Amino acid sequence: HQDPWKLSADKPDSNNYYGETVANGMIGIISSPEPLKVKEVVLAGTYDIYKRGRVSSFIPNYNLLNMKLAFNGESVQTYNINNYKQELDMRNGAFTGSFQFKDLATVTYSYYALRHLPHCIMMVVNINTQKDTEINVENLLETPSSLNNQQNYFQNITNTHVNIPLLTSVAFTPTGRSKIAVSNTFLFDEGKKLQPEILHRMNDADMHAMSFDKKIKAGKTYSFALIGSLISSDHINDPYNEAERLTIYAALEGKSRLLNRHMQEWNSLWQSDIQVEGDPQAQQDIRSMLYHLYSFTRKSTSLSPSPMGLSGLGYNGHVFWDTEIWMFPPMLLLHPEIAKSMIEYRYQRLDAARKKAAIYGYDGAMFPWESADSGAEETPVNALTGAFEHHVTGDVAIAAWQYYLVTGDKEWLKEKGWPILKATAEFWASRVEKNDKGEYEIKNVVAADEWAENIDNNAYTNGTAIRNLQYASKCATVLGVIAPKEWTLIADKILISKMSNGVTREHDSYTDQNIKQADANLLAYPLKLITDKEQIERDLKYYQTKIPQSDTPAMTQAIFSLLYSRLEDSDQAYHWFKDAYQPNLNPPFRVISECKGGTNPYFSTGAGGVLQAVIMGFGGLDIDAAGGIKQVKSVLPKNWKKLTITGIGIEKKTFVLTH
Amino acid sequence: HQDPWKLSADKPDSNNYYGETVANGMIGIISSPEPLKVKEVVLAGTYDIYKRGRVSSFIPNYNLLNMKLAFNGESVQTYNINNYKQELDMRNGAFTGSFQFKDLATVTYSYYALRHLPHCIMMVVNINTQKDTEINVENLLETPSSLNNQQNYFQNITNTHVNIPLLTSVAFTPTGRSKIAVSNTFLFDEGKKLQPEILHRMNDADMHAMSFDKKIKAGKTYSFALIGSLISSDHINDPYNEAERLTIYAALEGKSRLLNRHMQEWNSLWQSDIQVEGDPQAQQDIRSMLYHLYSFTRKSTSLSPSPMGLSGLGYNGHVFWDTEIWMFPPMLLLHPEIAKSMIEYRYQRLDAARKKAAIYGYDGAMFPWESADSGAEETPVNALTGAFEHHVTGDVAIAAWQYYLVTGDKEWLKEKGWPILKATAEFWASRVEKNDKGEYEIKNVVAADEWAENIDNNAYTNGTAIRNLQYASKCATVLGVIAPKEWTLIADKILISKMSNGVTREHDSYTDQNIKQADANLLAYPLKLITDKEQIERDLKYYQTKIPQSDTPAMTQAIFSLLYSRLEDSDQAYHWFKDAYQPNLNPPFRVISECKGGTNPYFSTGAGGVLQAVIMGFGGLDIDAAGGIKQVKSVLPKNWKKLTITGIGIEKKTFVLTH
Amino acid sequence: HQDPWKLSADKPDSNNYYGETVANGMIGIISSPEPLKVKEVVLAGTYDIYKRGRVSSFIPNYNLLNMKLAFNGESVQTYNINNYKQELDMRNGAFTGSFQFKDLATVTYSYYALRHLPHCIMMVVNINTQKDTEINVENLLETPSSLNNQQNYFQNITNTHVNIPLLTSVAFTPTGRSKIAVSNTFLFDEGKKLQPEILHRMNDADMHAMSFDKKIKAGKTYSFALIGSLISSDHINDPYNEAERLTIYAALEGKSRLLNRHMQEWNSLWQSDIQVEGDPQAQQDIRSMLYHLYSFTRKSTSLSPSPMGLSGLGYNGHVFWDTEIWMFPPMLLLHPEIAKSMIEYRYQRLDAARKKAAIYGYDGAMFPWESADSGAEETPVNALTGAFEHHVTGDVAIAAWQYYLVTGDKEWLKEKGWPILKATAEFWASRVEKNDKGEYEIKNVVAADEWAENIDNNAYTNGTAIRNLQYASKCATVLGVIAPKEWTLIADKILISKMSNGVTREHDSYTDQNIKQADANLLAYPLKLITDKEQIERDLKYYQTKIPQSDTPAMTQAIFSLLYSRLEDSDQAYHWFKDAYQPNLNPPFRVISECKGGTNPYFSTGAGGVLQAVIMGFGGLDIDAAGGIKQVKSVLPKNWKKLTITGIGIEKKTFVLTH
């Protein structure tokens, strides 16, 4: 099960199964262990009050691919199939199930979140029978209990050439905030006169279905497709009509043209790749990390991923610094247009950040700890991160400057980077307090180490304020605008303190407490405020054992790996690489949970960190403060013969590393 | 009935009557055969789900002018009046009825959609007595069944000088999308103390009325006016209060000031005119065409006409390429500020076109087949045009570029034209497919000939893509920007094929099918991709008999006329000019239906086409590719002694043509 | 009772009591004569249909500070306390009450509209015991009858260190337009383990409460604080969660940190101050005027004050020219960043002014007589000012140009000032009529003297049209853009006439009528179209006799004062300075009513005028037509030994004047 392009599971065990996701950055479909079913469907950009946190959330959506297959009236069940296998093809995000029904027939089904059509899904079903047989096929549209006020429709769209039967539902999110429409059709090869008659049943309040029968002859394969479109009032004013329009459009494009477009967009994503010689498990794991980041982002949008991307309702679908510092850097090096969408998300929410700053008594733009539709603060009120974890503003500034460093797009810096950098620098200039000694303090925050609450002069927070102020000043210079000279004066005097052993102090109350995640070590990478290798090493030695095994998220060990790679320590770098994700895995597809032994995949934030350990750590790739991508000294794991990284920077460079 | 300024009807026949429209580009009022009634009122910019197509629509509104008149308690009806006449004065959009009631009085009523006050209507009533009589006058506000949740109000607005009685209704469009308010008052000459007492009745759920009595001695003229304001939440946040404010304002202005401003604005519109010597019927018909375009548009707005303007709910009030290619060109030459409003409609909806392109898997801006409030796709889902008729994007680009060519407004090109041309070119660059031979194809469209569905390389569509890419490239140069070299490479290699007889092929599946309307011939005019006179002629000979007599819209024969004028063939040009509209007329005012023998006037699209046959065909006027208006060779109909076109181009040039 | 920083009342008389306001430009809290109660709370920016005028209004909000205090089960009332005093400290907007309860304790309470946290309020209560006692403390959240569909919540926010009990309500404005959230907590000094248990009662439909008991030994001080956050959907998408988040934030900042931040911001505001030597009552009155303008405005916003600021529902909270001409000039000289917010309010409402112009048949931007949320007209329909008092458009233009003169901010002129000046100039160019003598008239207005309705060529109106046209032309020159030459042509020929007595004629129907307020005198100041001191004196001597004692607002005598100050006549200047506000005062805090003997305080318009009489009049300070502030000839009242004005202009200049 160590194909470098395919994740595979034989006989899914429903008692120990964590589904995999196919997604196009707009819709995510999470697999079921049951044949011809999906577990959960998530639509990006649709938020309403729902369950966790009493704040906006992603909403479980229509399981629009759900199918029932019968042979001569006998429904497919666990007890009557064999050689049941699932496979995820990471080359094209195809999720395939295959099984034999008794000794009678073989069934394959592949489904796709179409890469070029953000709101369109397709499942292709192939049935090969060894004897004459009749199939009954049903597609069910069950309204999930997350939605209300549903309506269940069915109609025929016809002309002299086609009969497109549409199974449509329209429903609302819990508070009525968003109207959802879904529209499904069956595609046949045999043409209007010979295609099966489609029946419609509405037997339940929350479910309707379309169905057909088809005679298949011995030794013949019968193929059909299910196309679905899923869209909301967050995406279009009239989702009901747009869903039916899209499904009609996709039906008359046809399966071939749809899969060809899908393949072309996936081929383009995989022009940036990471190849490992000598470690098939690492090769597959790293492909899975790239696959999930590619599936959970979309170029040419203003979409940003949640910590769980489109794998479910993890962290309510909210956007955190998990994007800017964890998922954004590897995407900026491999596909700058993905990074551009992530920062566009923030640019279009700058108004909401100015409003938050004003409500909390500050100048400029104060980005929220958790962001959703509006860009207003969305953190559950019971979590003190929302009111007090202020480094997110610096994290947004850092990503915006990095975008310009890697692309050199000065028109983007004028139109979007500078508005962000100027407003965020104005925030920090208003956020600091000058003390007796002329130093600048940032008092009463929640640390990057979120176990440290309502403390002063957090190392990471203060570091992000310094970088935000420096980068805003640098930006002003590049564009020929005059920056307040106070920004540089403040940056040079923001407190970063050492304990008596010379170790960077996490905050003013810090001695030897356990910490949730990397904080002081982040001043070495990503901030590069600490470059002295002896300082980097003494900070690693003091803090690396401060992170407990339990209830600590995957936002630490990838940084330890990267820093040990920069120190040219192969044994420590590889130890921390494995520790970053292997103890977090869930079967049968090695999806990644947030914490060690956790059960909440897929934590895309964790994948983003590990990709930095591979690209920036083992590959030595670095955003040069002066612009572009440079390469610094690195080591490989002992057992890696070659590391090849393709599509890096706007010159699309290939880097090869060997021992 | 061939007055060059007035359309007149004696004794309206309600069994064979198609009403005429007065409009100010915001409100349209369509005439009733019944005296002192109107059939329908339409407010621009107000759309909701209603009847046809399951998509947004114009909504029948308050018939706010409806009046009941009694003489000595005897109700005035079609059955008991004589010498009843109706007249539309095209000089000032006055609709006038006049009749005799027995031996008592002559009644004249004139109503107006006030040209300067977009939301204000006025009816003026004169009663000339032959005997002593008492009139009872009632103004009815009946909530049409298109509206719901109505409220019926009445109050006196007073000071020492006035008593302004306001009859107000507020109601909602079917889904609650739009709140409509209407407020009416009576104006009297005799002043506060002597004016009639105004009674209010609320006897029905869906109707209330204000009324008065007045004794008039024999041989006197008694005059009163009704002023109404009609506005919605689409136009103003508080329509209820703003309707009352507007009616009070208009009442205090008075009839004389209102009609003087109205006259001044209509006089300005008619400073661009078409004068024909030798053909009184042509002179009246052409004045009717100009009058309807002037009535159905408004300078200094973001309004664009539907194919039926404000004559009713034709095509749901949606905006089509009917504006860009059919109504826009004659308005650009006569009144560029009207053309500016039409293209402003599209500029304001550029973000909705970007959203459509993303949903359908393209780059840039994909303008919708049918547009309404948002600029999202509004085509009924049962019509494949909405998903597949893509030339509308090129049509918007062509109009944008022509606006700049005619005005030379480089500031408008920078702020609005270029955003349109750049985004629409980016769409076409993403829409084409390169083939093995290095040609660019546009596969799977609905043709301009909409009977050809899901075909490849439509002539008109491919031509609009070429022009969009060429004009965007030219625009970039005017503004000192380097357009992507790909735009010219694609433009130069987009497929336009010929059949073995050398005739331009309509699409890759086209041999000799009947066609709905002009498609390949549009490559000659308006696109001017075909300039060779033998090629123009070969294409006319092959396609001119491909358009059936039945169920074919007025989007063909005007182009045939214009092309035969350009070929200096007076007999063919005049044949096609008459065929373009005369078989489409409805009595008694020669309004134009969409198709031959049709009954759905007024098809403003057809008038726009015919006005191009007159201005660009008979007049030889042409948009110069290098800027401004030029004149090419033309002919007149044999029976036209002189054609005079005034107010052309930003120099407001007069063109005179004789034999 | 004549402290230069504090307003004091002994034993409030509920039968003759006009409450004083503490405000931060977002929340106003108006005092009750009853201990530990507030009369009214107003939230800026929240408007809905409510009572007066049938148009949008400020809404009475939660009296969130309402407290009930009992000693040994005995309820504290006005009738059983003694030595009860109230005091407003203008230095920090602290409202303090203090009283003795029998032989048990002294109670002191101080409340604040926190200056740095626009949505946060704090009350601090100190109990100083003379005997052992037990207090019962209740904080009540009563939903006012202005709101509907309330919900009453209570929860504990806890961690190892804190238990923050939140008393929260959520409700809606009358039409459901706005959702309001309020969240309160108690702060204690003693810590989580020792703090009182907080009980919650929900006994009424419209009220819930949180309460505690505390035993206090004799001779001890016990202190507690109430913090509350008040916010709406007009301010934030999710007011419910944002109110709770803000109160948690404020609780974990704590009383000391909040008051320090509050004091810092009030210290900054008072860096611009007016010091009078030899007249303690004038010193205190002028402080009260500065205090109210500082409390009723907020830098770095788009808020503009109503005529009553946040003192209540006066004039529905609508924005009038009372800002541009009355409150804006003193704030522009003292704190340009306050003036910037006031003009930002108009800039962000330019689209609505363009819409109003279009609806009334004009070009450009027509600012409404009364403005609220959208910028559309909000004047009650029964008042003709809404449709007909047109000088407001010139008033906005004047303020926009003055902002540029005083700041010299050319980037602001390009982005905001020019859009205002260009559109308002276009309005006036479309508003004038040229007569047979080549002069420009403005006909059928309501005058600045609002008693003159539907008249022609109002002096002040014509003056503002001239300045608007001139300043738009000067603006075009500053930015190097071409202005229509018609603006200068029109400005030079707009009619301002003299009657046969050599007095400027108010309008074309004016001879000797009583006038509501200053009109023709405003051509001298502020417009400075009349600089001839003899014409100023003629207009002064005539019109100063025409203002009746009754029903005439404080928009007159302050100008008389300033002009007599400019002519160097102390006795007259001082007479009109006193008449401007002293006859409009309400006890016991000398709050200002709109009219002489009025009962509708606080008329901040009136304070604005008088501050101009002091700064521009007695101080001789003037906005120089060429940029910055200059000083012309002035006099002081006989009895004033010295006038000092600090923080003037962007140079922050101090001006000292003596006899």
Residue numbers in the entry:
A (entry chain A), B (entry chain C), C (entry chain B): 23 to 681
What did the article's authors report about this structure?
We determined the structure of the enzyme in unliganded form and in complex with glucose at 1.54 and 1.40 Å resolutions, respectively. The crystal structure of FjGH65A was solved using the single-wavelength anomalous dispersion method using a KAuCl4-soaked crystal because the molecular replacement method using the reported structures of GH65 GPs failed. The FjGH65A crystals belong to the space group C2 and contain three monomers (named MolA, MolB, and MolC) in the asymmetric unit. All GH65 enzymes of known structure were dimers, and the amino acid residues responsible for hexamer formation in FjGH65A were not conserved in any reported GH65 enzymes. The monomer of FjGH65A comprises four regions as follows: an N-terminal β-sandwich domain (N-domain, residues 23–258), a helical linker region (residues 259–294), an (α/α)6-barrel catalytic domain (residues 301–641), and a C-terminal β-sheet domain (C-domain, residues 295–300 and 642–681). Although the structure of the FjGH65A N-domain is similar to those of the reported GH65 GPs, a loop (residues 71–78) in the N-domain is shorter than the corresponding region (residues 62–79) in LbMP. The loop is located in the interface of the “dimer of trimers” and is suggested to be involved in the hexamer formation of the FjGH65A. All the GH65 GPs whose structure has yet been determined to possess a phosphate-binding site consisting of lysine, histidine, and two serine residues. In FjGH65A, the two serine residues are replaced by Pro575 and Ala576, and the histidine and lysine residues are replaced by Phe625 and Met330. Instead, FjGH65A has Glu616 in the sterically similar position as the phosphate-binding site in GH65 GPs.
